[PDB]
Design an enzyme around this catalytic site. Structure first.
Site, mmCIF file in Angstrom:
data_model
loop_
_atom_site.group_PDB
_atom_site.id
_atom_site.type_symbol
_atom_site.label_atom_id
_atom_site.label_comp_id
_atom_site.label_asym_id
_atom_site.label_seq_id
_atom_site.Cartn_x
_atom_site.Cartn_y
_atom_site.Cartn_z
ATOM 1 N N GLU A 174 -3.757 2.902 5.314
ATOM 2 C CA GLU A 174 -5.163 2.519 4.983
ATOM 3 C C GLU A 174 -5.725 1.708 6.136
ATOM 4 O O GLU A 174 -6.683 2.136 6.774
ATOM 5 C CB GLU A 174 -5.151 1.726 3.691
ATOM 6 C CG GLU A 174 -4.712 2.585 2.537
ATOM 7 C CD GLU A 174 -5.308 2.206 1.214
ATOM 8 O OE1 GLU A 174 -5.141 1.063 0.781
ATOM 9 O OE2 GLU A 174 -5.943 3.078 0.585
ATOM 10 N N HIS A 226 3.097 -1.473 -4.182
ATOM 11 C CA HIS A 226 2.901 -0.019 -4.164
ATOM 12 C C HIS A 226 2.679 0.406 -2.742
ATOM 13 O O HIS A 226 2.610 -0.431 -1.835
ATOM 14 C CB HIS A 226 1.698 0.390 -5.034
ATOM 15 C CG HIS A 226 0.427 -0.179 -4.529
ATOM 16 N ND1 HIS A 226 0.011 -1.433 -4.923
ATOM 17 C CD2 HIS A 226 -0.480 0.256 -3.621
ATOM 18 C CE1 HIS A 226 -1.074 -1.740 -4.273
ATOM 19 N NE2 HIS A 226 -1.407 -0.721 -3.449
ATOM 20 N N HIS A 272 -2.300 7.394 -9.292
ATOM 21 C CA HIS A 272 -2.844 7.256 -7.904
ATOM 22 C C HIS A 272 -1.791 6.723 -6.954
ATOM 23 O O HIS A 272 -1.928 6.983 -5.751
ATOM 24 C CB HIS A 272 -4.121 6.404 -7.752
ATOM 25 C CG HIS A 272 -4.215 5.166 -8.561
ATOM 26 N ND1 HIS A 272 -4.715 5.176 -9.855
ATOM 27 C CD2 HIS A 272 -4.012 3.868 -8.225
ATOM 28 C CE1 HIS A 272 -4.758 3.942 -10.306
ATOM 29 N NE2 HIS A 272 -4.342 3.114 -9.321
ATOM 30 N N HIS A 326 0.679 3.540 -0.090
ATOM 31 C CA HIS A 326 -0.263 4.634 0.215
ATOM 32 C C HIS A 326 0.400 5.490 1.278
ATOM 33 O O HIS A 326 1.009 4.903 2.199
ATOM 34 C CB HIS A 326 -1.642 4.145 0.680
ATOM 35 C CG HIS A 326 -2.241 3.143 -0.226
ATOM 36 N ND1 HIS A 326 -3.178 3.509 -1.176
ATOM 37 C CD2 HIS A 326 -1.963 1.839 -0.413
ATOM 38 C CE1 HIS A 326 -3.524 2.378 -1.844
ATOM 39 N NE2 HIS A 326 -2.783 1.367 -1.440
ATOM 40 N N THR A 330 -8.573 -1.700 -2.296
ATOM 41 C CA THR A 330 -8.847 -0.408 -1.602
ATOM 42 C C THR A 330 -8.997 0.727 -2.586
ATOM 43 O O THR A 330 -9.183 1.860 -2.105
ATOM 44 C CB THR A 330 -7.769 -0.111 -0.543
ATOM 45 O OG1 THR A 330 -6.553 0.206 -1.241
ATOM 46 C CG2 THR A 330 -7.631 -1.234 0.460
ATOM 47 N N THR A 331 -8.859 0.486 -3.881
ATOM 48 C CA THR A 331 -9.142 1.503 -4.925
ATOM 49 C C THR A 331 -10.169 0.891 -5.838
ATOM 50 O O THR A 331 -10.254 -0.328 -5.968
ATOM 51 C CB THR A 331 -7.913 1.902 -5.724
ATOM 52 O OG1 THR A 331 -7.411 0.783 -6.453
ATOM 53 C CG2 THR A 331 -6.823 2.456 -4.861
ATOM 54 N N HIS A 355 1.805 -2.335 0.119
ATOM 55 C CA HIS A 355 0.952 -3.433 -0.359
ATOM 56 C C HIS A 355 1.722 -4.242 -1.390
ATOM 57 O O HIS A 355 1.998 -3.746 -2.488
ATOM 58 C CB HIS A 355 -0.344 -2.890 -0.985
ATOM 59 C CG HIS A 355 -1.247 -2.292 0.023
ATOM 60 N ND1 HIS A 355 -2.270 -1.416 -0.290
ATOM 61 C CD2 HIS A 355 -1.243 -2.461 1.360
ATOM 62 C CE1 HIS A 355 -2.885 -1.095 0.823
ATOM 63 N NE2 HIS A 355 -2.294 -1.711 1.880
#
Ligand SMILES: Nc1ccccc1NC(=O)c1ccc(NCC(=O)NCc2ccc(S(N)(=O)=O)cc2)cc1
Ligand SMILES: [Zn+2]
Length: 258
Positions: free
Chosen positions: A104, A92, A62, A94, A196-197, A117
């Site tokens: 995000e 990580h 992901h 996004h 957020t996941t 993040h």
């Protein structure tokens, strides 16, 4: 049929396996800069990364995580809205398929190309797995990325991505200095939220920096060559791995600055 970011398993589906998806403190959110209130009692953030020990980079299907040795107080976040000491475990990103989306959090509904993040856990809970069960377990430092000049301190990350193209691949990644990913200013917004996941746990103090970092179009293109799939599975580009903004509900976003 596991969660992901596709039509059939994307963010609008997550609530069926993770009902807290529709909870009271979900992340990310839109940051309305005019409604955020300046909190003059908020302290400067303390980012102490001089002894950080990176170990490994992992494609987890992901995103990719740069992991740190969090078995001692080596890279810690303190101050700001936080009580006590939060240890860096991983960072990580996004990102989008296009430069006009990928973040995000949003700022007055503006989407950035990507969002970093830096994930930290509260040392009073002893380990990360215990910390995610607590309302003050984690502190995530969020940094927006815009496309323009290259970020020199990102390039060592960009150059290893060819070695972790597919889900489950890892590579040694020692001596990476996460100070090279920070903007000049540590002015921030802060609010209580969530992962957020999945599992979307409501354990995060979010600290989102106002100043984005600039990365080059070539740097973000290399993110978009990663794969969500495992080796020998049909190629699906790892792009648009972001959750959209969730309702603010009964929360106030606070600003460290005027
Ligand atoms: N380390 C540890 C220590 C003691 C006992 C157990 C553990 N747990 C693990 O090793 C482990 C925990 C979780 C995991 N996957 C799901 C998850 O919770 N992801 C975190 C996350 C999700 C999302 C964000 S975001 N996007 O920044 O909000 C930021 C972070 C995979 C591995
Ligand atoms: Zn994240």
């Amino acid at each position: 049929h596991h969660w992901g970011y596709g039509k059939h398993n994307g963010p609008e589906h997550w609530h069926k396996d993770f009902p807290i998806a529709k909870g009271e403190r979900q992340s990310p959110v839109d940051i309305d800069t005019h409604t955020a209130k300046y909190d003059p009692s908020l302290k400067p953030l303390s980012v102490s990364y001089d002894q950080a020990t990176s170990l490994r980079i992992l494609n987890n299907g992901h995103a990719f995580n740069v992991e740190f040795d969090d078995s001692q107080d080596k890279a810690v976040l303190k101050g700001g809205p936080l009580d006590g000491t939060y240890r860096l475990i991983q960072f990580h990103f996004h990102w989008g398929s296009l430069d006009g989306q990928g973040s995000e959090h949003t700022v007055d509904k503006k989407k950035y190309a990507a969002e970093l993040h830096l994930v930290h856990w509260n040392t009073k809970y002893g380990d990360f797995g215990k910390a995610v069960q607590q309302p003050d377990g984690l502190a995530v430092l969020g940094i927006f990325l815009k496309v323009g000049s290259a970020k020199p301190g990102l390039q060592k990350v960009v150059d290893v991505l060819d070695s972790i193209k597919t889900k489950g691949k890892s590579a040694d990644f020692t001596n990476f200095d996460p100070r090279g990913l920070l903007p000049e200013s540590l002015d921030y917004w802060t609010y209580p939220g969530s992962l957020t996941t999945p599992p979307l746990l409501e354990c995060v103090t979010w600290i989102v920096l106002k100043e984005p970092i600039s990365v080059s179009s070539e740097q973000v293109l290399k993110f978009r060559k990663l794969n969500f799939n495992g080796e020998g599975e049909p190629e699906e580009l790892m792009v648009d791995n972001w959750r959209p903004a969730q309702p603010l509900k009964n929360r106030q976003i606070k600003a460290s600055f005027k």
